């Protein structure tokens, strides 16, 4: 599953996690800690959107 950021369209590939944000391999975006936060374009979890229809 992935997580798109309606602000710009950033997708977090939960299948791999995020080597750019230094995160665990295969991490549920809905379970990441507060240490995870995109740049000015989005940051928390509620500001994202899964890929499900």
Swiss-Prot record:
Cofactor, how bound (note): Binds 1 Fe(3+) ion per subunit.
Requisite cofactors: Fe(3+)
Any Gene Ontology biological process: alkane catabolic process
Domain Rubredoxin-like: 1-51
Temperature dependence, free-text field: Extremely thermostable, being unaffected after incubation for 24 hours at 95 degrees Celsius.
Record key words, sorted: Electron transport, Iron, Metal-binding, Transport
SUPFAM superfamilies tied to this protein: Rubredoxin-like
Pfam families: Rubredoxin
Molecular function in Gene Ontology: electron transfer activity; iron ion binding
Keyword DNA-binding appears in the UniProt entry: no
Residues bound to Fe cation: 5, 8, 38, 41
Entry keyword Membrane: no
Domain of life of the organism encoding this protein: Archaea
Assigned protein family: Belongs to the rubredoxin family.
Function: Rubredoxin is a small nonheme, iron protein lacking acid-labile sulfide. Its single Fe, chelated to 4 Cys, functions as an electron acceptor and may also stabilize the conformation of the molecule.
Protein name: Rubredoxin
Gene name in the database record: rub
């Amino acid at each position: 599953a992935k997580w798109v950021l309606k602000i710009t369209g950033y997708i977090y590939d939960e299948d791999a996690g995020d080597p750019d944000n230094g995160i665990s391999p295969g991490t549920k975006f809905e379970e990441l800690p507060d240490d995870w936060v995109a740049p000015i374009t989005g940051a928390p979890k509620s500001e994202f959107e899964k890929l499900e229809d």
